[PDB]
């Protein structure tokens, strides 16, 4: 609905309700995660190498290719599996 | 503004245990290129002229 003559002052900088918006999005983000799986048994020693690529020596690989151990559906069997990762997710533990 | 990643990717499902799925990144079919973004030249220069003015 529109109004005539009445004139009010506003201030974006001490305005409220933005604070509760920044609260609410964080709370919605956290509520959208607890029904999903944890990734605890994944922190394990990774055997890694370079992906198959004709690499110039001065350039670095953006993809690393790693293999490791993981528990199967049972508790007794364990299997060897491989995957890909970016360089910004693995670091060097400290021959091989 | 356009942005794109061109590398074709294949997901893969490892099982952790009873009823737990986990998604790796499998094979890569194609050449390894680099994901990037494009914008137009003259529109960007003209809008920067606007904000300078």
């Amino acid at each position, epitope marked *: 609905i529109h109004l005539e003559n009445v004139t009010e002052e506003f201030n974006m900088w001490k305005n409220n309700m933005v604070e509760q918006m920044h609260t609410d999005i964080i709370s919605l983000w956290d509520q959208s995660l607890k029904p999903c799986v944890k990734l605890t048994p994944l922190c394990v020693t990774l055997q890694c190498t370079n992906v*198959t*690529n*004709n690499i110039t020596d001065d350039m670095r690989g953006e993809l690393k290719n790693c293999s490791f151990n993981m528990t199967t559906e049972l508790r007794d069997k364990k299997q060897k599996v491989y995957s890909l990762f970016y360089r910004l997710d693995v670091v060097q533990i400290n021959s091989n | 503004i356009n942005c794109t990643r*061109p590398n074709n990717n294949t997901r893969k499902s490892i099982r952790i245990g009873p009823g737990q799925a986990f998604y790796a990144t499998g094979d890569i*079919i*194609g*050449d*390894i*290129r*680099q994901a*990037h973004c494009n914008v137009s030249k003259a529109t960007w220069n003209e809008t920067l002229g606007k904000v300078v003015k």
Partner: antibody
Amino acid sequence: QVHLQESGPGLVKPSETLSLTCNVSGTLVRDNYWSWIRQPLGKQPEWIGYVHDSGDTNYNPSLKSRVHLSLDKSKNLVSLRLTGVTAADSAIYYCATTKHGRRIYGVVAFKEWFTYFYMDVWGKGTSVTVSS
Amino acid sequence: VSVAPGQTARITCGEESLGSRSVIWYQQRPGQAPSLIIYNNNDRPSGIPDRFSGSPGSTFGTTATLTITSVEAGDEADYYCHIWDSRRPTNWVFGEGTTLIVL
């Protein structure tokens, strides 16, 4: 019109320095990327390498140390030197010219492209046999 | 590898494709010097005849072919592929020969 000529001694003692020369016709040695090619009987031929002025002299990383390609701008020839030829290098040899080119797939500025070569014209060949 | 005269034969050579590749096809008559046929994937130099079908380079996970149509007795030549992939290093040796035995 162009044609070439392989030339070599042919009978080399084991562990010895081999040399080879390649004669030109018409097109001078400055113009073209040159190449040497080795082939034994019933085998795929082996690209020994390519040579040109201004550092365009990348070699085969198989041998890479005991072999020296070179040119001859005075007499307009193509020269090959080896060192320590053993019994494995019994083959016929070929000099050639080549034409290069660009293959481009992705972004140009990010070096997502490479160069290729192909040897257009061939020489005659020389049956170098290493023997004691 | 044998077909009737005037026909088309199918000739493949080398590894499966990985990325964008550039292929080179060379031929060689016996006793003589080597010789070019196809320099890009489907391009041939001037002075060379047609009817030599090559493969496109965009297809991934395939094998490079070479189809000869309207064959003859003069086409009896040892063939050599030379692949260049954008993922594998530089092949300093040539591919395996596929000798044709014409009818």
